[PDB]
């Protein structure tokens, strides 16, 4: 092939030549210069004038090699900074790809996929802008078969991601209506076999249930979490992880979305997930505990029963510090909503100890959720006359040298709390 | 991070 590194001025005499074959060659030319991995020449290629040229060849039906090569061309200038994929999107590039979702070439088709995907990639803007255009319906168009096995591979991943960059971003979240077209192929997907559909169309969940309530509902209610759940039990830790992002965002919702997320046995999974090798899924797994444990009463005593409190007991002991952090709010939120009995059962699992070692972090915000977290236990053996009981267990684990020392911290609710416990059960 | 590339380069084959 006679098109390997063309200079950008060849490019354009030849894109410029009214010679139908003389600006193949020279897009191709273009498609090579652009595709290569050290130093592409987009902005050279963005100041030549060449964006609205390449858009121009999207629309030659009669040449598919110079649609699928100015396709390319383009898909790869807009996979770049945002200002290179608005020269794309200022070029009239989105609704041309919109038209060539439609090429009977699939080669053709999916580069178009890929294109728009880059565009919705970009930012809330672009992404709505790309659904304005009409993206969807011919999108979905493509994955309407009996069954997505006889679909080719990575056209299936293309598309897939490409769906999840529709999902993606806030400020604003997608339009509802888009989000509701979109569900059930994406449940299908989800359904799929492939690990990487299975990826992105958890990572595409996971964008939908990051939200408000009714963002959440519109997802529960499409009957995902038993999958989800499964997906979280998964080997493959490029699934387990947006799988487990989409349960924790889930149960942020409320008690009923959370209880959805119990009852298909989610917590049976945590044991492994609490003790990851994986620093994140470790820390995701916690902060999802953290949320349950915000809960019913009825929800932590879930949590009690599925033998989890030992784990959080483990994950506050040693862990990444974030992880730890994530931990002491976990318990906080047990100890807030919990029985007596439940925040007893807490105490006899060991918590006090590694919660008052955690006190002589420089963290301000865990040492108030640590003394709170106290402040709700020490009110729990109030009311069984045992608050002596707690002062000498929190004495004698060097607790009481802390929050003695909290008194002189400087910021004012610290010492304010500290001082209260001092003055309350340590005189 | 772990989560999916937000734009994805069609690199030289």
């Known amino acids: 092939q006679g098109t390997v ?4 001025e060849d490019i354009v005499k030849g894109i410029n030549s009214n010679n139908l074959e003389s600006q193949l060659q020279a897009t191709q030319a273009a498609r090579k210069l652009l595709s290569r991995e050290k130093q592409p020449p987009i902005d050279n290629i963005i100041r030549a004038g060449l964006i609205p040229k390449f858009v121009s060849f999207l629309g030659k039906t009669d040449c598919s090699p110079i649609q699928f090569e100015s ?17 794309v999107v200022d070029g009239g590039a989105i609704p041309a790809f919109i038209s060539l979702l439609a090429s009977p070439h699939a080669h053709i088709s999916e580069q178009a996929v890929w294109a728009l995907g880059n565009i ?3 930012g809330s803007a ?20 009996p069954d997505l096995s006889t679909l080719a591979c990575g056209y299936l991943r293309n598309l897939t991601w490409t769906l999840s960059n529709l999902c993606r971003n806030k400020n604003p979240a997608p339009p509802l209506d888009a989000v509701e077209q979109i569900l059930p192929t994406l449940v299908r997907l989800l359904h799929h076999n492939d690990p990487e559909v299975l990826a992105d169309s958890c990572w595409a969940i996971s964008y939908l249930t990051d939200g408000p309530n009714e963002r959440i509902e519109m997802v529960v209610k499409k009957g995902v979490v038993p999958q989800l759940v499964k997906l979280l039990g998964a080997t493959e830790l490029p699934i387990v992880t947006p799988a487990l992002r989409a349960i924790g965002n889930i149960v942020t919702g409320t008690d009923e979305q959370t209880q959805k997320v119990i009852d298909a046995g989610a917590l049976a999974v945590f044991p492994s997930l609490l003790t990851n090798p994986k620093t994140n899924i470790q820390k995701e797994a916690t902060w999802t505990m953290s949320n ?7 929800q932590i005593q879930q949590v009690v029963n599925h033998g989890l409190v030992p784990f959080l007991v483990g994950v506050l002991s040693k862990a990444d510090f974030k992880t730890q952090k994530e931990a002491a709010w976990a318990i906080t939120n047990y100890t807030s909503g919990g029985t007596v009995e439940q925040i007893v059962y807490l105490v006899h699992c060991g918590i ?3 919660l ?10 865990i040492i108030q959720v640590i003394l709170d977290a106290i402040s709700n236990i020490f009110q729990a053996a109030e009311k069984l006359g045992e608050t002596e009981k707690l002062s000498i267990m929190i004495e004698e684990c060097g607790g009481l040298d802390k929050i003695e020392a909290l008194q002189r911290h400087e910021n004012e609710s610290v010492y304010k709390a500290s001082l209260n416990l001092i003055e309350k059960y340590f005189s | 991070d772990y989560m999916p590339s937000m734009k994805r380069f069609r690199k030289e084959e």
Do not use: C, Y
Not at chain 1, 126 to 145: Q, T, W
Not at chain 1, 356 to 365: C, I, V
């Open chain 1, 292 to 298: 349950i444990t915000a809960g019913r009463q009825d």
């Open chain 1, 352 to 354: 006090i100890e590694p």
């Open chain 1, 120 to 122: 919705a990639g970009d």
């Open chain 1, 5 to 8: 590194n063309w200079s950008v």
């Open chain 1, 71 to 87: 396709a390319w061309a383009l898909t790869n200038i807009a996979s770049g900074t945002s200002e290179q994929t608005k020269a």
């Open chain 1, 126 to 145: 672009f992404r709505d802008l790309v659904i304005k255009h009409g993206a969807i319906d011919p999108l979905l168009a493509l994955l309407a078969v």
């Open chain 1, 356 to 365: 008052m070692n955690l006190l002589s972090a420089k963290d301000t915000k």
